[PDB]
Amino acid sequence: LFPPQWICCDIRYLDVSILGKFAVVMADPPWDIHGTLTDDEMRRLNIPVLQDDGFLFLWVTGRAMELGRECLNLWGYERVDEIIWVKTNQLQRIIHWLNHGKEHCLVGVKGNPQGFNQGLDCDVIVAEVRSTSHKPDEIYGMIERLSPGTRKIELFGRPHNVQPNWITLGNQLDGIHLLDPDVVARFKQRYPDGIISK
Amino acid sequence: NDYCQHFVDTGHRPQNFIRDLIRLKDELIAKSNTPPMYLQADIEAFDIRELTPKFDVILLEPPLEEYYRKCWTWDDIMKLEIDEIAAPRSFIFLWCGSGEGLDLGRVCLRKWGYRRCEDICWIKTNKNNPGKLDPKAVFQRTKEHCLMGIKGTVDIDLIITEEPEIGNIEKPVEIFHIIEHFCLGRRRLHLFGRDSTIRPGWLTVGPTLTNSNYNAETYASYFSAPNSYLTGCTEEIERL
Ligand SMILES: Nc1ncnc2c1ncn2[C@@H]1O[C@H](CO)[C@@H](O)[C@H]1O
Numbered sequence: 001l002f003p004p005q006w007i008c009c010d011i012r013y014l015d016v017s018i019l020g021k022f023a024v025v026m027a028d029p030p031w032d033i034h035g036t037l038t039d040d041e042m043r044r045l046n047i048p049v050l051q052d053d054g055f056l057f058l059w060v061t062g063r064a065m066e067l068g069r070e071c072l073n074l075w076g077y078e079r080v081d082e083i084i085w086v087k088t089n090q091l092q093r094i095i096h097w098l099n100h101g102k103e104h105c106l107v108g109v110k111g112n113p114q115g116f117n118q119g120l121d122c123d124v125i126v127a128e129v130r131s132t133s134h135k136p137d138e139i140y141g142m143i144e145r146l147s148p149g150t151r152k153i154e155l156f157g158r159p160h161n162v163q164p165n166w167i168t169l170g171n172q173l174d175g176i177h178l179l180d181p182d183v184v185a186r187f188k189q190r191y192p193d194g195i196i197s198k
Numbered sequence: 199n200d201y202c203q204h205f206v207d208t209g210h211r212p213q214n215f216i217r218d219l220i221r222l223k224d225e226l227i228a229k230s231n232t233p234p235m236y237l238q239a240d241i242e243a244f245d246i247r248e249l250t251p252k253f254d255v256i257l258l259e260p261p262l263e264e265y266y267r268k269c270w271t272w273d274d275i276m277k278l279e280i281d282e283i284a285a286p287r288s289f290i291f292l293w294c295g296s297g298e299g300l301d302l303g304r305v306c307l308r309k310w311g312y313r314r315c316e317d318i319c320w321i322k323t324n325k326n327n328p329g330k331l332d333p334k335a336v337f338q339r340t341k342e343h344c345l346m347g348i349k350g351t352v353d354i355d356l357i358i359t360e361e362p363e364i365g366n367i368e369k370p371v372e373i374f375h376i377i378e379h380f381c382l383g384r385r386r387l388h389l390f391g392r393d394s395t396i397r398p399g400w401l402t403v404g405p406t407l408t409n410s411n412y413n414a415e416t417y418a419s420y421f422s423a424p425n426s427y428l429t430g431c432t433e434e435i436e437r438l
Pocket residue numbers: 009010011012028029030035036037133156157158169170171172
């Protein structure tokens with residue numbers, strides 16, 4: 001359970017109902033702005049089955065600032081916070097109309113979360129830019145203090161995103177790695193030959 | 199070093215640790231600026247169509263209840279008829295706060311016919327009072343958003359200043375510098391401005407102004423030919 005887990009897959013086609021319920025969902029989707037997902041594919045993602053009561057963290061940029069709000073609401077969440085990551089170099093200096101010094105992560109709530117530690121962190125992240133599309137690792141610590149020890153799931157993660165207490169999904173992960181017996185059981189029932197199609 | 203962890207340990211916000219050729223543009227803006235003009239008006243009871251001509255940029259700073267801890271709700275704000283005074287091609291800068299305004303201000307912009315092109319974040323440091331809450335908030339809120347909208351056909355989207363004293367509702371004057379650096383035209387309106395925000399190059403309209411000098415005909419005369427299409431960033435048009 002607690003150590004990192006992941007599933008290489010096309011998130012459009014995986015039956016995510018086999019994964020159970022999560023205290024926190026995070027996604028850094030490949031929005032079709034300017035290997036992406038159309039606005040309809042994003043709308044149709046089966047986010048609603050992933051949680052009963054908890055929080056969604058949704059990275060947005062450009063016109064996904066609006067489209068991401070649409071998906072969040074369609075999936076059944078109310079946006080209740082918005083984190084910004086101020087992007088710096090290793091010397092703590094900031095990296096169409098204006099130059100962009102930040103990226104935004106919408107925070108949605110679904111249901112009645114109980115026992116979360118709201119208010120420990122603030123809504124600004126200052127952290128160094130690494131590779132492209134690589135979000136800061138500080139978010140995992142903020143999320144862990146918010147909801148310690150609970151099950152969490154990340155969508156469109158890459159290998160460097162895998163973390164304890166998290167299940168990471170994405171098409172650039174290496175195979176499958178599952179340790180939670182509840183999840184292993186339901187995965188074998190649903191995918192007895194280990195193949196994910198349609 | 200994890201500044202998020204540092205904030206939970208010490209109360210110093212991460213933005214406390216951010217660190218750190220134009221004058222021949224700032225003075226052109228200064229040369230082109232109209233005289234400051236200002237009008238006391240209770241905007242809830244005032245027909246904004248009386249403010250003419252139509253504006254190249256509008257700065258809208260409704261007094262939200264969250265600023266204090268006569269306020270305007272987003273119900274009130276959304277019902278302002280901003281489209282009636284914006285020029286067919288024009289810009290809006292809407293201070294949305296940090297709560298539901300980030301959503302409802304976007305509804306406002308679309309309702310008035312704009313699309314959002316920038317999200318400018320005012321990030322507030324607490325260097326002077328380390329340490330120190332909306333019921334839905336998940337995180338401590340340490341920033342405000344000013345949304346930039348466009349209709350029709352050097353700077354960064356961040357303003358960093360120390361958090362102001364309790365009850366001080368002023369927004370950073372740096373928002374004016376960003377707006378004026380875009381060279382969007384010279385008809386500039388600041389709704390819900392105050393005596394303290396009056397500025398050359400701007401028409402300021404708001405309930406708390408103690409004095410007025412606005413005259414619609416005088417104001418329009420600043421933009422009649424040959425000065426109808428200046429950006430506010432070029433030389434004055436020679437006369438006589
Ligand atoms: N349908 C998809 N299913 C799973 N991962 C995807 C999909 N589309 C893009 N990605 C991945 O999401 C990540 C975006 O940073 C990249 O690893 C990218 O390949």
